[PDB]
Amino acid sequence: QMDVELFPFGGENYRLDYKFKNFYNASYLSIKLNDKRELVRTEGAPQVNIEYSANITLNTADISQPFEIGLTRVLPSGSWAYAAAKFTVEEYNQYSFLLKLNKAIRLSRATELSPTILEGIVRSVNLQLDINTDVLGKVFLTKYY
Amino acid sequence: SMALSQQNMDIELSTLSLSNELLLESIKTESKLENYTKVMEMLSTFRP
Numbered sequence: 001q002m003d004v005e006l007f008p009f010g011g012e013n014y015r016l017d018y019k020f021k022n023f024y025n026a027s028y029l030s031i032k033l034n035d036k037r038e039l040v041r042t043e044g045a046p047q048v049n050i051e052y053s054a055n056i057t058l059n060t061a062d063i064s065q066p067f068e069i070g071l072t073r074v075l076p077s078g079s080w081a082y083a084a085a086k087f088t089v090e091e092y093n094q095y096s097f098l099l100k101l102n103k104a105i106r107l108s109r110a111t112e113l114s115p116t117i118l119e120g121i122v123r124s125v126n127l128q129l130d131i132n133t134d135v136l137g138k139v140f141l142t143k144y145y
Numbered sequence: 146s147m148a149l150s151q152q153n154m155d156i157e158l159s160t161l162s163l164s165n166e167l168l169l170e171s172i173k174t175e176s177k178l179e180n181y182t183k184v185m186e187m188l189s190t191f192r193p
Contacts, residue, residue: 023146049148079179 002083004069012057016040018071023048024081026073033058034068045073063089090129103131111139 005017016031016039024045031040031054040054058067070084092100108115121142125134147153169181178184 048146 002071004071004085006087012059014056014058016054016056017051019051020046020048024073024075027076028074030072032070111143
């Protein structure tokens with residue numbers, strides 16, 4: 001019923017691209033961050049299949065946890081329609097990214113698993129995205145089952 | 146209002162499902178109801 005996209009520019013400056021798949025004749029559009037801080041407030045009902053854009057800023061305290069960007073359209077009758085998405089922003093050095101991309105390609109070619117399915121094996125072991133002997137023990141149990 | 150996307154061109158779906166949601170949208174705007182459930186509740190008691 002929508003798709004929302006988050007594109008980065010620099011340290012804190014991000015860009016919020018969104019687009020709605022159905023039309024609700026709303027009074028306004030309130031885009032909030034984890035129900036706490038309001039990012040975007042526009043007037044009138046947004047058009048269907050039109051990609052709108054807005055520049056937002058997120059500090060370090062918002063990136064450290066997977067946050068949620070909620071898009072609610074408030075009708076004149078008082079009721080609303082809520083639609084959200086949960087983002088996860090990771091930050092890597094160019095040397096650190098190419099070494100972790102080296103692990104992700106060589107493990108996916110050997111085990112014939114999808115990189116998203118390999119991400120679920122890593123994330124279930126530890127919080128950080130890294131491969132150790134505990135991850136490789138669960139890649140065996142995944143391929144065996 | 147229809148997007149000219151790759152998903153609208155490849156993904157097969159029922160013609161009868163496309164015809165119902167066109168009829169559900171027209172009834173929802175004339176009676177000025179809340180959703181498609183209130184359309185089905187209105188048809189459950191509509192006599193004539």
